[PDB]
Amino acid sequence: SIKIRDFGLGSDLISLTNKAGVTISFTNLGARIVDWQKDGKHLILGFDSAKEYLEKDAYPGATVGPTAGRIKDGLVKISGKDYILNQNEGPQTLNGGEESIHTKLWTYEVTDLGAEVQVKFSLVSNDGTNGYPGKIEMSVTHSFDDDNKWKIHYEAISDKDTVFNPTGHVYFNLNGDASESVENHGLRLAASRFVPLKDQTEIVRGDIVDIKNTDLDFRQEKQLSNAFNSNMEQVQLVKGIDHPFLLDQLGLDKEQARLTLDDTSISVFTDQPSIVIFTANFGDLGTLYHEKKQVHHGGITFECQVSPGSEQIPELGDISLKAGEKYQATTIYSLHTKLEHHHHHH
Amino acid sequence: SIKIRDFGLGSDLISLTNKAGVTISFTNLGARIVDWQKDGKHLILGFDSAKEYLEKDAYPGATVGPTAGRIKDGLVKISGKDYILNQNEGPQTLNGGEESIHTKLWTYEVTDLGAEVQVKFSLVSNDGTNGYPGKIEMSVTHSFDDDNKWKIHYEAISDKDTVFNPTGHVYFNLNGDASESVENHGLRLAASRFVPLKDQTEIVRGDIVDIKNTDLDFRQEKQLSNAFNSNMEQVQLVKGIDHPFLLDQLGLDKEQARLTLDDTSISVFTDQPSIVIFTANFGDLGTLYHEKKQVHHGGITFECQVSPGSEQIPELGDISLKAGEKYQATTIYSLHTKL
Ligand SMILES: OC[C@H]1O[C@H](O)[C@H](O)[C@@H](O)[C@H]1O
Ligand SMILES: OC[C@H]1O[C@H](O)[C@H](O)[C@@H](O)[C@H]1O
Ligand code: NA
């Protein structure tokens, strides 16, 4: 079933229930996921209205871009030309600049395919918006099906050569309570290397480092507490995880990551080369989610994209987008129950 | 009474009915007026869904900007520096360039004051959007009251020196049907001068012309057909009216123009110095409004703003907006019925 209602400020809430009874909801404010529940329990973090997003934190569950992450000094080179983008984090351009796409009302249309329901959000980034050459016609399609798969399909075409590398900023918290840390969740991640940050400004260091057999090695499932309790420099620097992980094997067919808690697992598939993981290292900020003060480590993201830093480390990729060339990216989050035995205590 | 409903593509339709039974409706798609009707008749032109605006004509009823009108070569000088804006009509920048503020969904809040209801729409234009320096935080408040006054109040703040001169683009048609020409309406307008156009490109010619005692003198009520049947080169050039008229006396208290058809009249008030009047000179285009094929001259606008062409005729004014200054503008359309 599909249901729609006003969500505040002119945005709407689109809520779907599949045949298994799982419900998921989105809003056109930032083409974002608001909630995902199973048996009355929240699997992700979200607010109860639009204003909350605008007043507390506008990134959760949103579509962010045109470029996700930080671009050092907001400088990119596009077809031999240097362009300076909007700098909203010191000299850095973070998640596309200020008042970016995650803050806009996108138009949308819903398509019911029976076993699958699609929500296609559209927006146009005018040429020159926040310094990005355009115009860029973008669309984000979120779909949910009877197999409990939530898929995000991105498409974009630009009138001018530009850069494009958006991602989805959902936060998972299988505890269903923001006040409960994710340290008790199990993580499996198919990545042997990571990208270290230079310092507190969080720009990339310049190197790629192998993490095998360190507390950041999750090729084999381990509790998140291992990472959180680590005194590895990188962990101390950010007070948790806030890094890009390079996937070892590319392809939409491979389970790149799996997040488990008791009998629930979330699997991650994507066609992108990296996964930026940030564990809500907010300290005592205590943002209120459903009236629960969020704890430090009270959430975890899986931002699938080309790794941030390619400006400095060319080996990570190329996010340029040529005029008229069609961009596409697909990321899928699927839910399962009893995929494995996960019985621990913290 | 206030009613909110889906208007398509995620846009909302907000309808306000006052004590008098008059209904006015707006959409956040482009902070726009969609309808205005008394005793079952539409007073303005509008569509029945969001899609139509996007497919047919996105300007009707909309808030247009940042700059209303045509800018020659898309060129503006800011702090002595040349800036090229998006060009969407040949080399001109018309109505802020392509995919401008009129095609975006604005956020909004409704405030019910009893005798008056206000709908405040907001949108942030990012720095660099379509070539315009910013960011510009804008709000347009459309309000409707028990006295049948529809007021538009604009406010904006920019982080950087920029240009700003928006307008409301509603088209009136008291016939209540687009297939009927407004030639039968009577118009009165408090302007003794106008800005002629250079040619079919519609950029300004360069001068200011006195219209006293010409077919465009509406200082004294007159019927539209007059202007429409004139042989003035300017009328013939565009096949109607598509020009900036310079108000003789500025101030919101003065009735600047009045559009009348029989018992029903529309008065216009503004704090702007000019009114751009365009009579839907679309020829055979035939756009469909409520299933009715539109006729050449099947509508008329009253675009209150600083006249277009200031880039070439400074006397017209200046649309500069300095960083941190607060822009304000007010335009009122008051409805009256003779008893
Ligand atoms: O809260 C936004 C969040 O977005 C990304 O995950 C960044 O890596 C984090 O450092 C933080 O900026
Ligand atoms: O249709 C848009 C409309 O906008 C303004 O009124 C112009 O002066 C008219 O020529 C026309 O372009
Ligand atoms: Na809506």
SS (H, E, C) A285-341: CCCEECCEECCCCCCEECEEECCCCCCCCHHHCCCEECCCCCEEEEEEEEEEECCCC
How many other C-beta atoms lie within 10 A of the C-beta of residue B6? Answer: 15
Q: Give the C-alpha separation, A170 to A187, whole Å.
A: 16
Q: Using an 8 Å Cβ cutoff, are A248 and A192 in contact?
A: yes
φ/ψ of residue A144, rounded to 5: -140, 140
Ligand 3 centre distance from Cα of residue B43 (Å) = 25
Q: In total, how many domains does chain A have?
A: 1
Question: Under the phi-then-psi rule, with left for phi > 0, alpha for psi from -120 to 50, and beta for the rest, what region is B128?
Answer: left
Longest CA–CA span in chain A (Å) reads 55
B105–A108 CB contact, under 8 Å: no
Given a contact cutoff of 8 angstroms between Cβ atoms, the answer to whether B168 and B154 are in contact is no
Q: How many of the other CB atoms lie within 10 Å of CB of B102?
A: 23
Tell me the structure's resolution in angstroms, rounded to a single decimal.
1.8
Is there a contact between A286 and A171 (Cβ–Cβ < 8 Å)? Answer: no
Sheet holding B274-278, edge to edge: B209-210, B191-194, B242-247, B274-278, B303-305
Count the alpha carbons within 13 Å of A135 in the hemisphere toward its beta carbon: 17
Place of tokens 């008030």: B269
Method: X-ray
Among the bound ligands, name the one nearest to the CA of residue B50: 3
Q: Is the four-CA dihedral A26, A158, B156, B195 of positive or negative sign?
A: negative
Q: Dig out the tokens for A50 from the structure.
A: 């639009």
Distance (Å, whole) CA B18 – CA B16: 6
CB B333 within 8 A of CB B150: yes
Q: In angstroms, what is the span from residue B278 Cα to ligand 2's centroid?
A: 7
**E strand segments, A186-299:** 186-189, 191-194, 209-210, 222-223, 242-247, 257-261, 264-270, 274-278, 288-289, 292-293
Pairwise CB contact (< 8 Å): B28 & A107: no
Spatial distance between the Cα atoms of A273 and A248, rounded to a whole number of angstroms? 8
Which amino acid, residue B296?
H
The tokens describing A243, both together, are: 């890094």
Ligand 2 geometric centre to CA of B129 (Å): 21
Q: Which of B29, B103, B124 sits opposite A99 (nearest CB)?
A: B124
* Residue B302 DSSP label: -
Strand order in the sheet with A23-27: A2-8, A11-17, A23-27, A32-38, A41-42
Q: Which ligand minimizes its atom distance to the CA of B303?
A: 2
Torsion angles phi and psi, residue B22, rounded to 5: -80, 130
Give the CA distances from residue B231 to residues B223, B234, B239, in Å, rounded to whole numbers and listed in that order: 16, 8, 10
User: Which residue has the CA at smallest separation from atom 7 of ligand 1?
Assistant: A69
Minimum Cα–Cα distance from B137: chain A residue: A99
- Which residue ranges have their beta carbon within 6 Å of ligand 2? B 59, 202, 242, 278, 301
A278 Cβ below 6 A of ligand 1: yes
First CA to last CA across chain B, in angstroms?
25
Nearest residue on chain A to B14, alpha-carbon basis: A10
User: If DSSP codes are grouped into helix, strand and coil, which group holds residue B233?
Assistant: helix
φ, ψ of residue B331 to 5 degrees: the values are -135, 135
* Residue A61, Ramachandran bin (φ over 0: left; ψ between -120 and 50: alpha; else beta): left
Q: Which of B331, B174, B151, B183 is nearest to B260 (CA)?
A: B174
Q: Do B7 and B13 contact (CB within 8 A), yes or no?
A: yes
- Continuous segment of H or E residues that includes residue B266: strand B264-270
Q: How far from the centroid of its chain's Cα atoms is residue B333's Cα?
A: 11
Q: Which residues of A touch B28 (CB under 8 A)?
A: 10, 105
State whether the Cα torsion B108-B110-B111-B115 is positive or negative: positive
Strand pairing category for A149-158 and A162-163: unpaired
Chain A residues touching residue B97 (CB < 8 angstroms): 126
Contact A65, A100 (CB under 8 A): yes
Identity at B111, one-letter amino acid code: T
Rounded to 5 degrees, φ, ψ at A227 are -70, -45
Give the number of whichever ligand sits closest to the CA of residue B170. 2
Cα–Cα distances (Å) from A284 to A9, A277, A300, in that order, read: 29, 20, 16
What are the tokens at B233?
């080169």
DSSP assignment of B76-127, as one string? EEETTEEEEPP--BTBBEETTSTT-GGGSBPEEEEEE-SSEEEEEEEEEE-T
CA–CA separation, A86 and B145 (whole Å): 42
Chain A positions touching B10 (Cβ under 8 A) are 12, 28, 105-108
Contacts of B103 in chain A (CB under 8 A): 124
Dist. CA A71 → ligand 1 center (Å): 13
Please name every residue paired with A63 in a beta bridge, in sequence order, or none if there are none.
Answer: A168
Nearest to A216 by CA among A183, A237, A193, A246: A193
Which residues lie across from A242 on neighbouring strands? A278
The radius of gyration of chain B from alpha carbons, rounded to an integer in Å, stands at: 19
Give per-residue burial for A270-291: e unless 16+ CB within 10 Å, then b.
bebebbbbbbbbbeeeebebbe
Which of B107, B109, B129 is the mutation pick for testing A, counting most A CBs within 10 A?
B107
Q: What is the CA B240 to chain-centroid distance, rounded?
A: 17
The residues, any chain, with a CB within 8 Å of residue B100's CB and separated by 6 or more, are: A126, B64, B65, B66, B130
Measured between alpha carbons, how far is A299 from B310 in angstroms, rounded to an integer? 55
Close Cβ partners of A222 (under 8 Å, ≥ 6 residues apart): A186, A187
Phi, psi values for residue A342, rounded to 5°: -135, 95
A318 Cβ neighbours under 8 A, 6+ residues apart: A306, A310
Q: How many whole angstroms separate alpha carbon A164 and alpha carbon A135? A: 12
Q: What angle do CA B2, B7, B11 make, to 5 degrees?
A: 95
3-state secondary structure of B39: coil
Amino acid letter, A34: V
In DSSP terms, A111 is beta-bridged to A118
Interface test with B, best of A55, A108, A126 (most B CBs within 10 A): A126
User: Residue A333 and residue B96: Cα distance in Å, rounded?
Assistant: 40
Residues A166 and A64 sit within 8 Å (Cβ to Cβ): yes
Rounded-to-integer distance, Cα B208 and Cα B193, Å: 7
**Chain A residues with at least one Cβ partner in B under 8 Å:** 4, 6, 9-12, 28-29, 86, 97-100, 103-109, 124, 126-132, 135
Atom of ligand 2 nearest to the CA of B278: 6
Closest A-chain CA to B129: A129
Rounded-to-integer distance, Cα B138 and Cα B161, Å: 15
Nearest Cα residue to atom 11 of ligand 1: A278
* Structural tokens at position B272: 């702007």
Chain A residues with CB-CB distance to B29 below 8 A: 107
**Mutation test residue for ligand 1: of A56, A202, A278, the one with most atoms within 8 Å of CB:** A278
Establish whether the linkage from the previous residue to A133 is cis, with ω within 30° of 0.
no
Residue A6 is part of which domain span?
A: 1-346
Q: Are A139 and A152 in contact (CB under 8 A)?
A: no
Which tokens in the block code for residue B117?
């209801």
Tell me, what DSSP letter sits at residue B333? E
Element (H, E) at A226: helix A225-228
Nearest-angstrom CA–CA distance, A66 and A156:
10
Residue of A nearest to B99 (CA): A126
Quote the CA–CA distance of A327 and A65 in Å, as a whole number: 13
Residues pairing with B325 in the sheet: none
Between the CA of residue A101 and those of A221, B56, B120, B125, B168, what are the distances in Å? 35, 26, 21, 12, 26
Question: Strand A242-247's sheet: what is its strand order?
Answer: A209-210, A191-194, A242-247, A274-278, A303-305
Chain breaks in chain A (C to N over 2.5 A) after: none
Q: Concatenated DSSP letters for B164-202? A: -B-EE--EE-TTS-TTS-GGG-EEEE-EEEE--BSSTT-
Bond into A273 cis (ω within 30): no
A184: Cβ contacts below 8 Å, ≥ 6 apart: A175, A223, A224, A225, A261, A344, A346
Q: Which amino acid is at A38?
A: K
- Min Cα separation A108/chain B (Å): 5
- Map tokens 């900036």 to a residue: B244
Cα atoms found within 13 Å of the Cα of residue B101, Cβ hemisphere only: 33
Contact criterion met (CB below 8 Å) for A138 and A329: no
| Spatial separation of the C-alpha atoms in residues B280 and B182, rounded to whole Å | 9
CATH classification at residue B208: 2.70.98.10
Q: What are phi and psi for residue A232, nearest 5 degrees?
A: -60, 140
Contacts of B106 in chain A (CB under 8 A): 10, 105
Q: How far apart are CA A299 and CA A175, in angstroms?
A: 9
- B213 alpha-carbon distance from chain centroid: 26
Query: Cα torsion at B247, B315, B97, B99 (round to 10°)?
Result: -40
Q: Would you put residue B79 in left (φ > 0), alpha (ψ -120 to 50) or beta? A: left
Residue B64 · residue B95 · CB < 8 Å: yes
- For chain B, the residue count is 339
d(CA B187, CA B173): 12
Q: How many CA atoms lie within 13 Å of A148's alpha carbon, on the beta-carbon side?
A: 16
Q: Please tell me if the CB atom of residue A96 comes closer than 6 angstroms to any atom of ligand 1.
A: no
- HSE-up of B285 (CA within 13 Å, CB side)? 15
Could you give the C-alpha distances from B269 to B151, B258, B272, B280, in angstroms and in order?
9, 9, 9, 22
CA A333 to centroid of ligand 1, rounded, Å:
20
Q: At B236, is the secondary structure helix, strand, or coil?
A: helix
- DSSP tally for chain B: helices H, then strands E: 3, 31
- State the residue for tokens 């898309």: B74
The number of the ligand nearest the C-alpha atom of A171 reads 1
How many residues are recorded in chain A? 346
**Is-contact A27 A39, C-beta < 8 A?**
no
A171 lines ligand 1 (CB under 6 A): no
- For residue A149, which amino acid is it? K
What backbone torsions phi and psi does residue B329 show, to the nearest 5 degrees? -155, 150
Helix (H, G, I), strand (E, B) or coil at A70: strand
**Closest Cα in chain A to B98:** A126
Residues with CB under 5 A from ligand 3 (ion): A 12; B 10, 12
User: How far, in Å, CA of A272 to CA of A250, rounded?
Assistant: 7
